[PDB]
Design a binder for these strands. Structure first.
Lengths: 95, 88, 130
RNA sequence: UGCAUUAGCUAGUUGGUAAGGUAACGGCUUACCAAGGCAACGAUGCAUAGCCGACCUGAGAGGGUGAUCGGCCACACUGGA
RNA sequence: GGGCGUAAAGCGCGCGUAGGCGGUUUUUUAAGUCUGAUGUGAAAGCCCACGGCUCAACCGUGGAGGGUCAUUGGAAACUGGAAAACUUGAGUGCAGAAGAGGAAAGUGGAAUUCCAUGUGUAGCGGUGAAAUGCGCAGAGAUAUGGAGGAACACCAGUGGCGAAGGCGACUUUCUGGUCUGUAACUGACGCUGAUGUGCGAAAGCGUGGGGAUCAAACAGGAUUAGAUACCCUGGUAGUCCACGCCGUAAACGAUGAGUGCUAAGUGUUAGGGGGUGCCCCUUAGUGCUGCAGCUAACGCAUUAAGCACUCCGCCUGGGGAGU
RNA sequence: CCGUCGAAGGUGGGACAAAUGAUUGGGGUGAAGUCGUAACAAGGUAGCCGUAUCGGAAGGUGCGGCUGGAU
């Protein structure tokens, strides 16, 4: 019904061990009460076309997350503003 | 609640060769699972009162389907009770 | 359908007021001779034969005069579901002593009121559609 | 008969069989027997009245429905054995 | 022999099954309408007649005679309750846009008060006529400045409104959720609804805090043949935040209730096509536009109270009585 | 003789009733003798709901509500 395309970017300096626990929390709020997703990915070394906060790198893990309870793209938006973990996210409502 | 193909395994294994929904034993089974599927949304959303009556209406429409199950179904009445988790 | 002749009574009456030659009364399983019981006299004129499929719709084929003169001055409901108006050997009514045909069905199907007293029975006339 | 200025009642309530003896089975007692069950059929409280065959009555649709005069049911200061 | 409006009538109670009652095609084994044991068929019974008492009580007719005591065993495609089945128009709202369901706000700079020191001394709180206020042993006026509040003028819109319920000195939260053109998914159609959570402006409630330009009362000022009133004023209370909770309304403009159709639309905040917005866009959340027919009239009609779909329902002695 | 049951009575507290004084109210009354436009038009204050108040009878300075406002 209400699909959401979240394309959040992580910090350029984060340990893999902590990165696994960082994506676990993001996936925990995305796959909460039913995942209903398409396919997960894990982009690595790459360059962004636009610059935001003058960084050096940034791990990627953008995955499609279809929802019906409208609670998967809730905390995520707040996570990329209050805490200093996410920088550039996304908020697409297109099916 | 559950997705079309995420709860079509119950219908297929409990319905005759037709690959479709609308059966009295299929509707009752697909509605009972829906209540359990929306049971996690009935906890956090307890302050709201515009969905609590919705389940009652869903059970009210299920009564009619259950009324036909009490007509002439004895082995088809306990088949949707010993297999799932309900009373009677 | 809550009332058998619900639309039936709200069709001919409305068609006899707006002058509707052809009518479209939702035909049923008993909505045939009940809407054409006055086919003997001329109240509801007459029709060939109810032709449709599994209770579809039946016409009445109403007819008027030169300046659209309606013979029926509004039709009201009397014998409906629930209560029963069974005229036995109590007392048969009379006004002009013979003219048209009404609702008196027993074991002869659809009969007129000419021999209504002869049979001394008063039931409701009905028939199937096609 | 209703109570709004009361809204509830039966617990061997609901059915079990056996000590007898009367017009009779016998939850009569007989051995034992349930939880909120019975009950809305207001059972359980009241209202309390002798009951009927009758005469007026809307024009019929509605409504009344006992003084007669006989059946019965009573009573015999008060109770009780 | 009662309305679902002035009459005799708007449950503000928006969220829910009183089994009273609200299309589901086909379809059933016989709920059923009119036939069947009839002997009996009597009666201070209206007995079809029946006996006279003149004005009075003069009583036989059980078959007639009804006041009988053949009305199916029965002919199912069918009040409320429907298995095989698909649909959009509604479900989340399928793509939409203003909603940020919601700004309380530190650095903040603009004030009635003291005073650094000024529209700094007649400046302001300041009257239907009727202003009170700022030393008598020592006394306000705010362009400012060293201050703001319950901090905040504009984005707060005939907004989405989902129940009587539309947000900020830009500003963040998605919180069920409601809607018009559209149907991706199974299929199946009622009562402003028995769970009316007793939700419910308002004084009173969990007012944490509260009382400041101020402001009831109070000093008062004022008439004319008549006004402690009201007006204004120094002037307590009186108005204020999370924390069981808090309840009448002009909740209904005295104006609640499932109908449509024989004129067009269907606006709002601003978002949308046929394809270029020229022809289309039924209509709803919202503002509703009159004509068949009713209603004694008044008045209901692309959302009648004509007539085909729910329980409800109000006038009963005017009264007394809302006591 | 032990016992079994019985009327009857002393009465137990309550309800129940009826007068009695004192009362506190009704429901009008003694007919504008007591005071007054207590309200309606454009009603010296333009109209009107629940309320803190609320009078020998008569309301409004608060609390939220009102076009039912004329030239």
């Amino acid at each position: 019904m209400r699909t959401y395309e979240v394309m959040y970017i992580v910090r350029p300096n984060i340990e893999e061990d902590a990165k696994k626990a960082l994506v676990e929390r993001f996936n925990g709020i995305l796959a909460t009460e039913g995942a209903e997703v398409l396919e997960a990915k894990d982009w690595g070394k790459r360059r962004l076309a636009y610059e935001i906060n003058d960084f050096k790198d940034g791990f990627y893990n953008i995955v499609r997350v279809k929802s019906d309870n409208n609670k998967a793209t809730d905390e995520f938006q707040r996570l990329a503003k209050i805490s200093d973990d996410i920088i550039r996210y996304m908020v697409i409502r297109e099916d | 609640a559950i997705s079309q193909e995420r709860k079509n395994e119950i219908i297929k294994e409990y319905r005759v060769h037709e690959t479709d929904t609308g059966s009295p034993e299929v509707q009752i089974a697909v509605l009972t699972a829906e209540i359990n599927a929306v049971n996690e949304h009935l906890r956090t959303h307890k302050k709201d009162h515009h969905s609590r009556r919705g389940l009652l209406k869903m059970v009210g429409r299920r009564r009619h389907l259950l009324n036909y199950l009490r007509s002439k179904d004895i082995q088809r009445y306990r088949e949707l009770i010993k297999s799932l988790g309900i009373r009677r | 359908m809550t009332d058998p002749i619900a639309d039936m009574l709200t069709r001919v009456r409305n068609a006899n007021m707006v002058r509707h030659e052809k009518l479209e009364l939702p035909a049923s399983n008993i909505k045939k001779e009940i809407a054409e019981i006055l086919k003997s006299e001329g109240f509801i004129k007459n029709v060939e034969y109810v032709e449709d499929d599994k209770q579809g719709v039946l016409r009445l084929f109403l007819k008027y005069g030169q300046n659209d003169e309606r013979v029926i001055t509004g039709l009201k409901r009397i014998s409906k579901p629930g209560l029963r108006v069974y005229a036995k050997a109590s007392e048969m009514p009379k006004v002009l002593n013979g003219l048209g045909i009404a609702l008196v069905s027993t074991s002869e199907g659809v009969i007129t009121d000419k021999e209504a007293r002869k049979r001394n029975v008063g039931g409701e006339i009905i028939a199937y559609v096609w």
